[PDB]
Design an enzyme around this catalytic site. Structure first.
Site, mmCIF file in Angstrom:
data_model
loop_
_atom_site.group_PDB
_atom_site.id
_atom_site.type_symbol
_atom_site.label_atom_id
_atom_site.label_comp_id
_atom_site.label_asym_id
_atom_site.label_seq_id
_atom_site.Cartn_x
_atom_site.Cartn_y
_atom_site.Cartn_z
ATOM 1 N N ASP A 122 0.593 4.187 -2.689
ATOM 2 C CA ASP A 122 0.528 5.615 -2.312
ATOM 3 C C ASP A 122 1.649 6.384 -3.038
ATOM 4 O OD1 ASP A 122 -1.710 5.523 -0.582
ATOM 5 O OD2 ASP A 122 -0.387 5.369 1.238
ATOM 6 N N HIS A 182 0.848 -1.225 0.000
ATOM 7 C CA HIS A 182 0.000 0.000 0.000
ATOM 8 C C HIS A 182 0.869 1.255 0.000
ATOM 9 C CE1 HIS A 182 -3.598 2.260 -0.029
ATOM 10 N NE2 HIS A 182 -2.987 3.105 0.829
ATOM 11 N N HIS A 187 3.226 11.314 2.083
ATOM 12 C CA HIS A 187 2.672 12.290 1.121
ATOM 13 C C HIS A 187 3.507 13.567 1.153
ATOM 14 C CE1 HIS A 187 -0.608 9.485 1.007
ATOM 15 N NE2 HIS A 187 -0.750 9.664 2.350
HETATM 16 ZN ZN ZN Z 1 -3.160 5.229 0.816
#
Ligand code: ZN
Ligand code: FYR
Length: 299
Positions: A241, A237, A264
């Site tokens: 991302d 995951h 992020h």
């Molecule tokens: Zn995610």
């Protein structure tokens, strides 16, 4: 040549925001050559468009948020991961609310909806950003780096000191010449911890989260009655991302990304540092798809 791609047909889906919990209607529409991926808030009057470019990322708390003034499109990264995975260059993404629906917490439903509607090859060369020199960003014990590579590869390491992560795979490398984005990355789901949810909800995070759209981890076990899709689902995951966060470049990459506990925020910092460092990259096209170091599935 390797051609730009858009959708063959309009695609619709319904869901809820992971972070907002708000019900949202999603519409994917074809767009012309060199549009890129442009999100559109159709609940606002007038409608507000926000292109999916690194310069329009405004918040990176627990998702990638596109911002234009007070207008937000939250959690774009799973949908952009699916589009990067399928080679979609050009699309309008209409939303009736401020957050992309979470679906099952993965890119699986998005790759299924796009491949159902079908892809359209467009009469313009697909442009890639080729990494010519290393570009790295660090902050504390986190690192994100691009290095030259004749292809596209992602390496990622996480490091959680939680019993559920003990002895479990926390590092993975995926070379997209030899591995399916769809079979090995798209179905890896978002994961969250019971020990966080009271704080996260105080921050208007994970208001829509449940075992229906997330892996929920307690003191010593996964709560989801059906368990994991992959032994290495958590790190897969974070690769999902990363592919979505990095698609805010606006073009596919020829190179390798390595992430060390990067999320992020640092992924967006790496894009911004790459864009500023013009001697570290060039735009390339491939006049013959058969001789190119990266291939996409038949449309
Ligand atoms: Zn995610
Ligand atoms: O980040 C996520 O994807 C996430 C998902 C679900 C939960 C969650 C939901 C219910 C109970 C406990 C945790 C927490 C999370 O941070």
């Amino acid at each position: 040549m390797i051609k730009q791609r858009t959708l063959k047909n309009i695609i619709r889906a319904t869901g809820v925001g992971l972070h907002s919990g708000e019900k949202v209607y999603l519409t994917l529409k074809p767009a012309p050559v060199d549009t890129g991926i442009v999100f559109s808030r159709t609940d606002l009057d007038p409608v507000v468009e926000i292109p999916a470019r690194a310069e329009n990322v405004g918040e990176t708390t627990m998702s990638t948020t596109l911002v234009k003034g007070d207008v937000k499109v939250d959690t774009v990264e799973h949908l952009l991961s699916a589009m990067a995975g399928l080679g979609i260059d050009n699309a309008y993404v209409e939303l009736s609310a401020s957050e992309v629906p979470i679906m099952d917490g993965s890119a699986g439903p998005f790759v299924f909806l796009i491949q159902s509607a079908g892809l359209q090859e467009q009469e313009a060369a697909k442009k890639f950003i080729r990494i010519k020199r290393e570009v790295s960003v660090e902050e504390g014990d986190k690192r994100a780096v691009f290095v030259p590579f004749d292809g596209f590869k992602v390496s990622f390491e996480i490091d959680f000191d939680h019993p559920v992560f003990r002895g479990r795979t926390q590092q993975a490398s995926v070379d997209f010449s030899s591995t399916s984005f769809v079979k090995e990355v798209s179905r890896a789901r978002t994961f969250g911890f019971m020990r966080d949810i009271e704080y996260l909800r105080s921050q208007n995070l994970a208001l829509g989260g449940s075992v229906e759209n997330a892996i929920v981890v307690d003191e010593n076990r996964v709560l989801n009655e059906d368990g994991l899709r992959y032994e290495d689902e958590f790190v897969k995951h974070k690769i999902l991302d990363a592919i979505g966060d990095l698609y805010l470049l606006g073009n596919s990459l020829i190179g390798e990304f390595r992430g060390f506990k990067s999320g992020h925020a640092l992924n967006n910092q790496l894009l911004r540092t790459l864009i500023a460092d013009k001697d570290a990259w060039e735009v390339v096209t491939f006049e013959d798809a058969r001789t190119a170091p990266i291939s996409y599935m038949r449309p």
